[PDB]
Point group: D2
Chain length 111, copies 4
């Protein structure tokens, strides 16, 4: 697994489950191409987005649909989504996000 | 101001000075139109981006150029930038502070919204 | 001031108002002596804790009573409080801002230190 | 495992390895008793601190020796340590901390 995603809920102290995540790669023409997507699991994780063959060097955007997550909990959140944009330049990338209605934090663990 | 940005540096324990910030507003045709830009001051703050008249309802993107910040200090960071996307003024005018706390492989952002 | 505390609420997107804060200083005998206390204002800030004269070198503990904050709002949070422990003024006088961003099961803290 | 700890490094985007962690329980007399300790692994994790038998309801303090971690990297950090103080009131508790020289963040994931 070259790329994983993890999402936590800072209000409830739980994984953030069933959160939609879309990944994009920047194309030559400077636009974003759909690359991979999924929903976080019961553990707040999304594995199997890509393979090491397909995950070549490039600029990637990971978009986390935080607004839907909070709306489902009856909470009016601030952000439309959380985006994480980074260059992958070669082994394993974990993109983690910790969510609150008016705040989020993200870190990369690269091993 | 109705829109202020504040950026802090978690490595140095200081304001993040001279960080470029670009603000965009989503246009009728669903593209991001330039709205305002600036750089953070010696206090890590950026004021004067817009007026209450021009800051109408809409979806705004605040892009904080964190990579240029860390590279100007000679560090190779993870992220290209930090983006904060939000709907503004949809229940009348509010004042927004977007705060960001930066490290080379992590950032945090919060919003303080007052009426 | 040489010591200020600022607290924000990540659930409401607001300053965290009326948060109790107790500051202690490590004594010669290795126990925590009361140094100062107060509550955050409507802006989430707490000033006037100490003077540059009284804020000598030492190890300080800033305890932010986050549990009392969340319970006063009727939420059951995880932490008892948030503690920030640091050595101060060991290379001469500095001004310290301790900032905290609060959620029921998480908090973040940073320091801004200026000369 | 009723209690785990995890530590990440926000500067380098890596687990924080070989970080000393001490756990304490509040005794009747309102003092802190040593309860458990260890060093984080290569994955930045500390498992096997306690058993479900021994991890009864009570107030616990988890102290993370962040100052030594940064000092070993040639970095002068702000905090003496990071402390996480909480009541355990019954299944599984993960205490995570994300570290920078002048900042740290901590969350509890309770499942
Ligand atoms: O200067 C402020 O008002 C301020 C300082 C720091 C933070 C902050 C943050 F942006 C992320 C995480 C933790 C923080 F305290 C928020 C606001
Ligand atoms: O268990 C993890 O992988 C994990 C836990 C917590 C965090 C995190 C974060 F993404 C931002 C702020 C504080 C945290 F502990 C990151 C990763």
């Amino acid at each position: 697994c070259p790329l994983m995603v993890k999402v936590l809920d800072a209000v409830r102290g739980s994984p953030a489950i069933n959160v939609a995540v879309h990944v994009f790669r920047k194309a030559a023409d400077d636009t974003w191409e759909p690359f991979a997507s999924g929903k976080t699991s019961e553990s707040g994780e999304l594995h199997g987005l890509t393979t090491e063959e397909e995950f070549v060097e490039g600029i990637y955007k990971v978009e986390i649909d935080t607004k839907s997550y909070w709306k489902a909990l009856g909470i009016s959140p601030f952000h439309e989504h959380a985006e994480v944009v980074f260059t992958a330049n070669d082994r394993r990338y974990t993109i983690a996000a910790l969510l609150s209605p008016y705040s989020y934090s993200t870190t990369a663990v690269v091993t």
